[PDB]
Every structure is written in C-alpha cells, then in structure tokens.
Design a protein around this ligand. Structure first.
Ligand SMILES: *[C@@H]1O[C@H](CO)[C@@H](O[C@@H]2O[C@H](CO)[C@@H](O[C@@H]3O[C@H](CO[C@H]4O[C@H](CO)[C@@H](O)[C@H](O)[C@@H]4O[C@@H]4O[C@H](CO)[C@@H](O[C@@H]5O[C@H](CO)[C@H](O)[C@H](O)[C@H]5O)[C@H](O)[C@H]4NC(C)=O)[C@@H](O)[C@H](O[C@H]4O[C@H](CO)[C@@H](O)[C@H](O)[C@@H]4O[C@@H]4O[C@H](CO)[C@@H](O)[C@H](O)[C@H]4NC(C)=O)[C@@H]3O)[C@H](O)[C@H]2NC(C)=O)[C@H](O)[C@H]1NC(C)=O
Ligand SMILES: *[C@@H]1O[C@H](CO)[C@@H](O[C@@H]2O[C@H](CO)[C@@H](O[C@@H]3O[C@H](CO[C@H]4O[C@H](CO)[C@@H](O)[C@H](O)[C@@H]4O[C@@H]4O[C@H](CO)[C@@H](O[C@@H]5O[C@H](CO)[C@H](O)[C@H](O)[C@H]5O)[C@H](O)[C@H]4NC(C)=O)[C@@H](O)[C@H](O[C@H]4O[C@H](CO)[C@@H](O)[C@H](O)[C@@H]4O[C@@H]4O[C@H](CO)[C@@H](O)[C@H](O)[C@H]4NC(C)=O)[C@@H]3O)[C@H](O)[C@H]2NC(C)=O)[C@H](O)[C@H]1NC(C)=O
Ligand code: NA
Ligand code: NA
Ligand code: NA
Ligand code: NA
Ligand code: NA
Ligand code: NA
Ligand code: NA
Ligand code: NA
Ligand code: NA
Lengths: 215, 165, 216
C-alpha cells in the first residue's frame, strides 16, 4: 500500500472520548472534531457527522476562535452513546470549507483486538524506603487489552492526587501493563490509612475494580 | 566636476535577496559599474546578476559619460530557505508597508505566517505578500515569516521595522 | 510506489548513544546521524562531524538504502568516548546535499540538569498474584536524573530474559522514576531462588547497583 497525502488548506483532527467517560454510565462521552488553519478570508466551516455511515444531527459546533498565530480554530463536539462506542461503531467527521478543493473526512472508533481483563495488584513500600519522609504505594495493572484504561487512587473518602502513572507497556504475551505510584507522607502510611487503587477498563465486570492497601 | 549625480536602481527592488535570485542593477552612453570599488563592467547600462551567490553582496556604484559617480547601494545575498523583503525598513505614519516572504528558488510555500514581535499578524494558505495600507506606531517591531515547503517547516531571520514621528 | 514531491529536500535526525553503552567500558557508544527524504535526482550526501566544534574523521557512513516510498535513507555513525559524552561534549552532524540551500546541522549532547542518584527498591508479588502460575517481581527506580538509565535482571547471578521496563516518567520534583517487571514461574519464586534488579546510571557509584529480592 502506497502513501497518498493535504496541501495548503485547513487541517482536521478527530479525537475519541475519554476512557472513563465511555466506561461509567453517568458520565458523558464525546468525540471531538477540531479544524485548524482556517483563514480569515474563508472562515466559515461546515461539519457533517455520521455514525456507521448514517448521518446524525445532534452535534454542538462552537464559535470559531482566533489563535495566537492569527488563524481561526473551530471545534464540533458529538455526544456518543456509551454502548455505541463500546460496540465498535465508527464516528465520521466531514469538514467543508471554501479553501478545500474537497471535504476532509476523518473516521474514528474504539481500538480493535481481543479484550483481556486487567489483573490489579497493590504493593506496599519497600522496607528500605521507610527510612524516608515520603513513601511509595504501587498499583500494578497487568494483562490488559486494549491499552485504553483509567487508573486512580483514593484515600479514605477522597481522591489522592499526588500520584503518577506510567504509560501502558506492551508485554511479551501481547497484553499491556502499567504501574501507578502514589507518594504519601510516611506518617499517613504508619497511622493505618487505607489507600485504594481504582481501575476502569472495558473488560472488567462493570468496567471497574478497586484494590486497597494498608499497613 | 559641474554636472549631475547618477543613481543606482534595482529590479526587483529588493536590496536583500537569496542565492539563485536574479538581480538587475540599472543606472540613470558609456556606463561604468563598480563593485567593492573594483571596476566590473566597462560600458553596459544595466548589470545583470543571473544567479546570486554570496560573493555578489557588497557596494555597487556607477557613472556615465556625462555624469558623476553615484551614491553607493549595499546589496545583501543571504543563504537559506526564507527571506523577508520590504522596499525599506523605515516608514512614516500612514505609509504603506509591503512585505514579501521570499522562498529559495521561488519554491512553493504553503501555510504561511507573517509574525510581529513573536505573534501572528497574518496567515495565508498559499504564499502571498503582506500589505499594510497605512502604517501606525503599532506596526513597529521585529518581523519574520514562516511556512511549509512540502512538510518541512521553515522560517526567515527577523527584520526590524521602525515607524517615525 | 510513485516518487513524491520532496520540495523540502532531506531531513536529518540525530540520535544519542544507548544509556548502557556510555556506562559500560566494555561497550561502544555511538551517535547516529540519519538522513531521510533523499531524492533519486539528488542522491549525494556529505557528512561533517564535530566534537565541541573540532572536526573529527572517525565516522563510518553506511550505504544508501532505498525506502518503500521511493526515497533514500542514509546513516552515518560516530563512535564517542564514554567520558566525553558523560562530561557534556557537543556532537554536531552537518549534512550537505544539493537539494538544500545550506547544510543542515544538528547537535546533541547529554541532558543538562544536576544529576541525581536513583533509589532502587525491590517489591515482591502481591499476595493476590500468588494464586497464579506466573508471578511478577517489581523493581521501582525513583529519584534519578537524567532519564538515561538501564535496568536488567538476574536469578542466582545469571541473566533473566522475560522482563519489561517502563519508560522513565517525570515525577513531581523534576526527577524521574520507572518500574521494571520480571515475570517468573511461581515455582521459581517459592523455591527460594534469589533475584536481582540491576541498575546502571551515571550518578551511581561505578555506574551500577544491584538490589536483591527473594522469599522467606
Ligand atoms: C496555529 O495555532 C494552532 C495551535 O493552537 C495550531 O493547531 C495545532 O496544529 C497541530 C497540527 O499542526 C495539531 O497537532 C496535532 O496535535 C495532536 C494532539 O492534539 C492534542 O494534544 C495537544 C497537546 O499535545 C493539544 O494542544 C491539542 O489541543 C490536542 O489536545 C486534545 O484535544 C482533544 C479535543 O479537544 C481533547 O479530547 C477531548 O477532551 C475533552 C475535555 O477537554 C473530553 O475529554 C472529550 O471526550 C475529548 O473528545 C484531548 O483531551 C486533548 N488532549 C490534551 C490537551 O492533551 C496530535 O495527535 C497530532 O499528531 C498526529 O497527526 C500528525 C499530523 O500533523 C502526525 O504527525 C502524528 O504522527 C500524529 O499521528 C497520529 O497518531 C495516532 C495515534 O498515535 C493515530 O491513531 C493517527 O492516525 C495519527 N494521525 C493522523 C492524522 O494520521 C498533531 O500533531 C494541534 O492539535 C493543533 N492544536 C490545537 C490546539 O488545535 C496550528 O497548527 C497553528 N497554525 C499555523 C499556521 O502555524
Ligand atoms: C519515506 O520513508 C522513510 C522511512 O520510514 C521516512 O523516514 C521517517 O521520517 C520521519 C520524519 O518524517 C522520522 O520521524 C522522526 O522519528 C524520530 C524517531 O526515529 C526513531 O524511531 C522510529 C520509530 O519510532 C524509527 O522508525 C527510526 O529509524 C528511529 O529509530 C531509532 O534509530 C536510531 C538510529 O539508528 C537508534 O539509535 C541508535 O541505535 C543503535 C541500534 O540499532 C545504537 O544503539 C546507536 O548507539 C544509537 O545511536 C534508536 O534507538 C532508534 N529508536 C527507536 C525507538 O527505534 C523522532 O525522534 C522524530 O521526532 C522529531 O521530529 C518531528 C519533526 O518531523 C517533531 O514533530 C518531533 O517532536 C521530534 O522533533 C522535536 O523537535 C525538533 C525537530 O525535529 C528536534 O530537534 C527535537 O529534539 C525534538 N523533540 C523531542 C524529541 O522531544 C521524528 O518523528 C522517522 O524516523 C523516519 N524514519 C526512519 C529514519 O526510518 C520518510 O518520512 C518517508 N518520506 C515521505 C513519507 O515523504
Ligand atoms: Na479557510
Ligand atoms: Na467505537
Ligand atoms: Na517502594
Ligand atoms: Na511501593
Ligand atoms: Na496504612
Ligand atoms: Na554530552
Ligand atoms: Na504482583
Ligand atoms: Na511485584
Ligand atoms: Na525466591
């Protein structure tokens, strides 16, 4: 297959919903079609949206905004049904503008391939780290496919957000893993506080599991 | 020495050019040409530089049979993808400002921006010249242009524009 | 395929040596200058190399390889001294080609920033994993700068093969961290074998440290 690219007009980028939005029913997932490099001379952009080739009419197009570089950017947002997205339907965005010799079409859908359930394991701090002021709580998330996932940490009630998560790494068996690291003051760990790693993924039962870790 | 002063004119009017540009120096019939004070052409009225190279830069002067040695013209031959050209760099309020984003060998240049003090002033899908009809004080500052040659992103060195009062 | 418009002419990408190559004297670190979008019409490529502005002559230019898109790719490789690279010398590849108005120059050197020593922590399998036929031995390596690092594993002093290591992640204090995971058959863990996470980094004493892990 040969690469056929295009030259000197507006460009289009189509972005998927966030994983957490498709996976928790009360959240609102969105596909986003962004048009950049719109001139002042031909600023008007038209969007047509399709879900598996059938045109839909519920998309919210925003006003155009002039960028720092003096081009216009325009964004159209389409609300998706959770089940549509997870059943693999294709969302197409078609963009029309007078500086395009023809409309630009982009298509996006959920990652293909056989899903694999994540296995989620929490690991306490190394004995050798307890000599520091701050300690590291580890959540290992392995065996998952596709790579789309959300991992978050919580402490008692609330979200703990002094953590960082690695990207997904392709493992030797063709599934993915990642690690997430929560840093907490050693006193909070030694006083018996319960820390929980929450994971959301399409191949968990109810798209959710939670593992906790205490002293 | 009781005569008039001759004058050098360039076509096109760009005093700053890229290598492989054509330049034509003209003198306003035995017309002599001077380049860095060395004599270049004995009689011809215009001096054609077909495919500019860095050594063509410098001071040009001329005289004719019945006129005195001209004031000098500095010609500057630059190396690179993009050169931002203007008829001059000092404008008074309400003067037109004409800027050209000139590519090496007139290569086609798409998604072009002219910037002023780091910020977008004008964008074009295909290369075009930037015309400001009426200069104000707000047009003063450093400018450059930039764009894509194929998929390669290229930009010109900066140039200073002063607006006078 | 149809040969495309390469109005831009060539492009150049310049790659550092591998972290392990600069840290082990038995290995040979290289800088790699790669030239892509070389045309059939203007195929000739020249290379000039400089170390802190001094030209050097010990680069090895590999021969043109045609690509699937009907462009050439050309690679020049310069061996560097471990200590030159680690002390911050600048390597410059200059690439000449008649489709360019001027030569392209790229320069590379190691990450600047105050070095910081990796703290290395081994973590056994979660109790929950122990119900599986394979288990996961974890090595956390945190607090290090620069991001250039290498990690390996051993069992009773002989190298293991089935491990994966994450890319380095920027932590909240501007240092880096990563985890490395080795997968072993549960029996190897329960049998009391001694595993090791080995870490190589410029801020470690002798560029090396080993941390062990096993069951009691
Ligand atoms: C003038 O000024 C403009 C600057 O404003 C400038 O516009 C930029 O132009 C760039 C092109 O020149 C364009 O570059 C692309 O960037 C892509 C990533 O964009 C995200 O990340 C950027 C930061 O890295 C952000 O700045 C962007 O805004 C964007 O951020 C994301 O935005 C989406 C939608 O808003 C958002 O998702 C939505 O979030 C909401 C809540 O906000 C909900 O969660 C919704 O549910 C959800 O839908 C994201 O959260 C948000 N993420 C953030 C902020 O992090 C990048 O992907 C592009 O790269 C691909 O294409 C290029 C071609 O140019 C390839 O070279 C490259 O290989 C990439 O290839 C892709 O790889 C994919 C997988 O890896 C593969 O699947 C694809 O097939 C493949 N793509 C293709 C096409 O084949 C690209 O670099 C940039 O986004 C523009 N910026 C903005 C702000 O619009 C303009 O260029 C300037 N003009 C001139 C003349 O100078
Ligand atoms: C026709 O076909 C051609 C063949 O594919 C095609 O060529 C490609 O062109 C691309 C540009 O269009 C080019 O893309 C760049 O890729 C960079 C990464 O390249 C590595 O990884 C790729 C896979 O991800 C491989 O395909 C590459 O070959 C390459 O792999 C590396 O190879 C080296 C050297 O051999 C190796 O190091 C050496 O390893 C050996 C072992 O063999 C030894 O250990 C040596 O000691 C050691 O030196 C690496 O390990 C190996 N890595 C891997 C992972 O395999 C990427 O860095 C580039 O990104 C920059 O440029 C774009 C602009 O295009 C920016 O948008 C981007 O952010 C990056 O640039 C930033 O901004 C500056 C401007 O460039 C830069 O100065 C900054 O530093 C930078 N900022 C950062 C990094 O934060 C870029 O995407 C691709 O490599 C080419 N493929 C090749 C050469 O195979 C050509 O385009 C086609 N023509 C068409 C369609 O017209
Ligand atoms: Na337009
Ligand atoms: Na889908
Ligand atoms: Na730890
Ligand atoms: Na830990
Ligand atoms: Na605790
Ligand atoms: Na260096
Ligand atoms: Na484990
Ligand atoms: Na583990
Ligand atoms: Na053991």
């Amino acid at each position: 297959p040969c690469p056929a690219p295009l030259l000197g007009g507006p460009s289009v980028f189509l972005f998927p919903p966030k994983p957490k939005d498709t996976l928790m029913i009360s959240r609102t997932p969105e596909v986003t079609c962004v048009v950049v490099d719109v001139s002042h001379e031909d600023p008007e952009v038209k969007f047509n949206w399709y879900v598996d080739g059938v045109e839909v009419h519920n998309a919210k197009t925003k006003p155009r905004e002039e960028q720092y570089n003096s081009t216009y950017r325009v964004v159209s947002v389409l609300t998706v049904l959770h089940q549509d997205w997870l059943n693999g339907k294709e969302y197409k965005c078609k963009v029309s503008n007078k500086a395009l010799p023809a409309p630009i079409e982009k298509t996006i859908s959920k990652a293909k391939g056989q899903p694999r359930e994540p296995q989620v394991y929490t690991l306490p701090p190394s004995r050798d780290e307890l000599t520091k002021n701050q300690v590291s709580l580890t959540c290992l998330v392995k065996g998952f496919y596709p790579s789309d996932i959300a991992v978050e940490w919580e402490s008692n009630g609330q979200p703990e957000n002094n953590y960082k998560t690695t990207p997904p790494v392709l493992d030797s068996d063709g599934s993915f893993f990642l690690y997430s690291k929560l840093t907490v003051d050693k006193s909070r760990w030694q006083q018996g506080n319960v820390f929980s790693c929450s994971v959301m993924h399409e191949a968990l039962h109810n798209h959710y599991t939670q593992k906790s870790l205490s002293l | 020495t009781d005569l008039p002063k001759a004058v050098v004119f360039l076509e096109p009017q760009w005093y700053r050019v890229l290598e492989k540009d054509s330049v034509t120096l003209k003198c306003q019939q035995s017309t002599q040409w001077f380049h860095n004070e060395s004599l270049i052409s004995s009689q011809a009225s215009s001096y054609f530089i077909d495919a500019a190279t860095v050594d063509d830069s410098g001071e040009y002067r001329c005289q004719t049979q019945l006129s005195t040695l001209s004031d000098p013209v500095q010609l500057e031959v630059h190396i690179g993808w993009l050169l931002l050209q203007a008829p001059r760099w000092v404008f008074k309020e309400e003067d037109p400002i004409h800027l050209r984003c000139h590519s090496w060998k007139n290569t086609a240049l798409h998604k072009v921006t002219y910037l002023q003090n780091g910020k977008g002033r004008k964008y074009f899908h295909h290369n075009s010249d930037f015309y400001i009809p009426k200069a104000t004080l707000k047009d003063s500052g450093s400018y450059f242009c930039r764009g894509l040659v194929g998929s390669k992103n290229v930009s010109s060195e900066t140039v200073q524009i002063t607006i006078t009062q």
